Design an enzyme around this catalytic site. Sequence first.
Site, PDB file in Angstrom:
ATOM      1  N   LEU E  41       0.824  -1.201   0.000  1.00 31.49           N
ATOM      2  CA  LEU E  41       0.000   0.000   0.000  1.00 31.49           C
ATOM      3  C   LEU E  41       0.861   1.255   0.000  1.00 31.49           C
ATOM      4  O   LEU E  41       1.940   1.289   0.597  1.00 31.49           O
ATOM      5  CB  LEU E  41      -0.943   0.020   1.201  1.00 31.49           C
ATOM      6  CG  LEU E  41      -2.251  -0.759   1.074  1.00 31.49           C
ATOM      7  CD1 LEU E  41      -3.083  -0.152  -0.012  1.00 31.49           C
ATOM      8  CD2 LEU E  41      -2.031  -2.196   0.767  1.00 31.49           C
ATOM      9  N   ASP E  42       0.367   2.289  -0.675  1.00 33.61           N
ATOM     10  CA  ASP E  42       1.065   3.563  -0.778  1.00 33.61           C
ATOM     11  C   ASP E  42       1.133   4.291   0.555  1.00 33.61           C
ATOM     12  O   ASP E  42       0.528   3.867   1.546  1.00 33.61           O
ATOM     13  CB  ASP E  42       0.385   4.470  -1.806  1.00 33.61           C
ATOM     14  CG  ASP E  42       0.589   3.996  -3.223  1.00 33.61           C
ATOM     15  OD1 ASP E  42       1.625   3.354  -3.488  1.00 33.61           O
ATOM     16  OD2 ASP E  42      -0.288   4.262  -4.069  1.00 33.61           O
ATOM     17  N   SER E  43       1.881   5.396   0.569  1.00 31.23           N
ATOM     18  CA  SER E  43       1.885   6.297   1.713  1.00 31.23           C
ATOM     19  C   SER E  43       0.467   6.706   2.077  1.00 31.23           C
ATOM     20  O   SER E  43       0.056   6.635   3.241  1.00 31.23           O
ATOM     21  CB  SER E  43       2.707   7.538   1.373  1.00 31.23           C
ATOM     22  OG  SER E  43       3.968   7.198   0.826  1.00 31.23           O
ATOM     23  N   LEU E  44      -0.298   7.133   1.075  1.00 29.52           N
ATOM     24  CA  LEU E  44      -1.648   7.626   1.289  1.00 29.52           C
ATOM     25  C   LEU E  44      -2.668   6.505   1.367  1.00 29.52           C
ATOM     26  O   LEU E  44      -3.742   6.691   1.943  1.00 29.52           O
ATOM     27  CB  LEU E  44      -2.044   8.568   0.155  1.00 29.52           C
ATOM     28  CG  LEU E  44      -1.529   9.997   0.106  1.00 29.52           C
ATOM     29  CD1 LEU E  44      -0.051  10.028  -0.242  1.00 29.52           C
ATOM     30  CD2 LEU E  44      -2.347  10.735  -0.928  1.00 29.52           C
ATOM     31  N   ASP E  45      -2.387   5.356   0.761  1.00 33.33           N
ATOM     32  CA  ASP E  45      -3.396   4.306   0.743  1.00 33.33           C
ATOM     33  C   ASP E  45      -3.630   3.730   2.133  1.00 33.33           C
ATOM     34  O   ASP E  45      -4.774   3.457   2.508  1.00 33.33           O
ATOM     35  CB  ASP E  45      -3.006   3.222  -0.255  1.00 33.33           C
ATOM     36  CG  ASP E  45      -3.098   3.696  -1.687  1.00 33.33           C
ATOM     37  OD1 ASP E  45      -3.857   4.654  -1.942  1.00 33.33           O
ATOM     38  OD2 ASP E  45      -2.428   3.107  -2.561  1.00 33.33           O
TER      39      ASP E  45
END
Lengths: 124, 45, 246, 71, 85, 44, 52, 163, 106, 83
Positions: E41-45
């Site tokens: 998962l991304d930083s924002l996800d």
Amino acid sequence: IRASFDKAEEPMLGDYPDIDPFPAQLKNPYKKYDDQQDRRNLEEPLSVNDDLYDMWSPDRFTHFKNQDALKYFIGFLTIFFGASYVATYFVPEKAAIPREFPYEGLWKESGGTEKSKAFFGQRS
Amino acid sequence: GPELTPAVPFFQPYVLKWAGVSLGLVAFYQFNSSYEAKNGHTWVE
Amino acid sequence: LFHLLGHAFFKALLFMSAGSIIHSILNESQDIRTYGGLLSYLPYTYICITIASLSLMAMPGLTGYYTKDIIIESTYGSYSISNYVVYWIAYLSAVLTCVYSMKILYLTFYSNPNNNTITYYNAHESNIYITLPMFILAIFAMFAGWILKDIYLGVGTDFVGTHILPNNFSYFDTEFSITQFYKLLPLISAILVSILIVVLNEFFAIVFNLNNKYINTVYSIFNQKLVSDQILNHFIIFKGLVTSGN
Amino acid sequence: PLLSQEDMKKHKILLAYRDRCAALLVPLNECRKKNYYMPWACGHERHEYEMCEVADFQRRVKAMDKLKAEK
Amino acid sequence: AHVLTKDMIQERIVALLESFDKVNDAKNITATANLTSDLGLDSLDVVEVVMAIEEEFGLEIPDHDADEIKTVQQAIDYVSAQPAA
Amino acid sequence: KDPWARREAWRYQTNFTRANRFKGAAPGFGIAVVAFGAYLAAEK
Amino acid sequence: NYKWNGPLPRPHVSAGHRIATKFLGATMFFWMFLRIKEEYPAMLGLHNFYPP
Amino acid sequence: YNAISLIIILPCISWLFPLFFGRQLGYVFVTRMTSTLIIITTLITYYYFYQLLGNNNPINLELFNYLNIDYLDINYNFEIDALTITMLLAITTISSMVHIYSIGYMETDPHQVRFFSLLSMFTFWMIILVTGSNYFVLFVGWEFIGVTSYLLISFWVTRLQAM
Amino acid sequence: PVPFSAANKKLVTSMYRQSLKLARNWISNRQLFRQKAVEIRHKFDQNAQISNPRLLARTLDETRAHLYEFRHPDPIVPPSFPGGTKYERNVPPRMEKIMQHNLYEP
Amino acid sequence: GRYPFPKDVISMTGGWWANPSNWKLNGLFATGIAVGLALWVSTATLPYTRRREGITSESDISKWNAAAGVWRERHGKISTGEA
Ligand SMILES: CCCCCCCCCCCC(=O)OC[C@H](COP(=O)(O)OCC[N+](C)(C)C)OC(=O)CCCCCCCCCCC
């Protein structure tokens, strides 16, 4: 430090900590505190005007600035009152004459006397 | 059905004291009024 | 007086139904933006709150009608010429009222669910002790106004014996002088604005959920009790505490 | 017929109701007292007083018409 | 009333992650899985995930604590530690 | 575009469809139309 | 609460509450109809009292 | 059987008896009893209203003197007339309904005796407010309802915002 | 002001959280809130790779100003938490023993 | 649901979830005292009750107004607005 009344007290302290006061209501409530309800930890220094900045102090609201909120309050009142007053001019006239009553406006029945019928007495 | 806490007697010492005093005062008042009606002056006077 | 008596009943019903709605939620939240759709889940509370709202909007044949409509009309019928402004002010207030009644009704029962799944699983009605008084206040808020209109608003009624100055008395004028436009306009506007609010919410949500800065500003003003509470707490109460310190 | 001052006092009519047909007010109020102010009853008397007030307001709107016409 | 169990929390969280789309895979979601590493998962996800978790259990996460949870075990234990959940 | 579009489906499905979401918004209205027609007939 | 992120089952509501809802709704609608019929001229605004 | 007397006094009982005896009765009985007293009061008020519509001759209840100094003569005088009976209708109906409602709404809370006593207190003092025959009794009720409002709005004492 | 650092990470994740809470608070309708959320996502995505200090600093400042412009008068807070309506309601008493203060009187 | 609470805290309201084990018998006592007090006062205050109108006669009212006029004539008393 920030407010005028706290600044006024600076000559009147000698060897007491000049604390910058922060509204305890605006301290974010998720930090842990020794007294969670008052959001104070033990031995925290108190501003001289603390009683104006604790939780028991009158609530402060952050949305509008105080001056701005004053502008809005006075603006609403002025626009409402002025619109109503100017609306009084553009008014239709009625259609039926006001009602009248027998015996010179029943001035006998609302007390009254022969010498004073203007004080008590209807439209007749 | 809700739970059930321990028994407590209805008439406590304070109930007895205050009820007894108040009722005695009202009874005394009525007795004086009646004693007035008969004797022509109240028993306290 | 008659509006006071009539208003007491359906206002108590509003509050009680609100309590039931709150109690139905596990979170016990009171925010209207987190209720979602409960019409299937809570039909009896829905019907009680609906009756209360319709009485409040003075829908025809309900108790709030016989109070609110005639009070609105007495302003036009008043002998003082200046009261015609008060007519339009009160009229605006009435359609204003239909607005928020419909907003609460829609956002509680008619909107798509906004709360998580477990609440909707566990959403259920309340006990008998809560339900019965709502039932009784519903029959009141439907029938009391009609059964009592003669007692307080009667052509010649002497029940309340207040001695009205004959010059001031105008209750006949307000009925005979009223025209079809003024006697029908509040009702027609109420029904239309109710339907308009519902259809706009269900079909054009953008017009309510815009993002304009100026409209957000005015909405913020209205949301904080018309920024009056700010004015009090800062300029009266806080200034007085400062002066007390001085 | 316009009620006697004595009669109008004797029935204790309210001051604002004392008009050219408080005469029909009296029976209407008596009926409203016998029944318990119930909406369905006293229909005839209620209508009779209302029809007074119709004639009454009518003479008023004509008087205002005449006043308007003078200007 | 209503009371939750640790397994109920875990089941709800597993379903939550299952329905999220930007996940790598559904089967690979483990109890000790790292959203940053395993699920990628991304930083924002993961931020979107913590918002979903709070919206699901009806709580409010402070900024300092939300970023602290990195594994699903951390999330389940944190949600079980809060009484009003 | 929505990565949570699977999370939000239930909010628009069976119990929360427009047809179902407005069903039961006028309870007893059919009984009311029957009763009003019947009273119209009986009153004459 | 068997299903999550899935379609929800039809809510279960007591017989008494459905019966109460039907009675209240029927009564309100019927009362409103009766009132409109009985007062139509006066509530709608008819038979102007002014002289023709 | 005196309608005005029962109207003023049953709510007083429903207020004071919980305070005097709550530890001895418990919230089950306290709730049921206060509710029942308020119901009886409401029924008496309806009967009185019925008769008053029959015959508009209000009842007066004149009791001992509060004040008899100089020209001021203040008495505990109560009456129930058309205005007062309208207010009493509203008050007793809604108080009885709320007392019933609070049995269900408040079933979980620890402090139910105090709550129901306060509801009954507020009902009693409002009845005093609307029934008194002079401005002084009006003021007595006027301020005691404020006291009860303070005690009710801060019912959950531990909540800072409440107080 | 690092283009990619842990502190940058924490800051932007906090701001992005914020933006989302604001969007939820402002939009009543669920569908509309979803489109607002996806637009906010795209807008963060586009400016993700800024590198030079001046442009990144300016963008962060401007987004802070944007968020401050769109702050809500009353955020949604669950009942059991600080902003909530259940907060501190029926707080269970601390269990304690009575300390005496007087030798003669309890 | 519920939680622990200190048992030593004695309050005349009863404290936490007060539900005494003999509550039905204390309840009988309480309702007995209630009916006693209500009935006693309802009877006791009966003599101080009266209707509003019909208490005095028109004779008394008219003669009192006439006496008041006599008083206002013995003194030099004009009426309100009589000027
Ligand atoms: C719980 C509320 C009950 C109130 C009514 C029930 C009482 C039954 C009898 C009715 C008559 C009445 O109330 O007065 C009680 C008595 C009798 O006065 P009276 O001459 O008959 O009245 C006059 C009626 N006139 C005008 C028709 C003639 O007056 C008094 O001693 C006045 C002293 C005040 C009481 C002393 C203080 C002690 C209280 C302790 C405070 C905590």
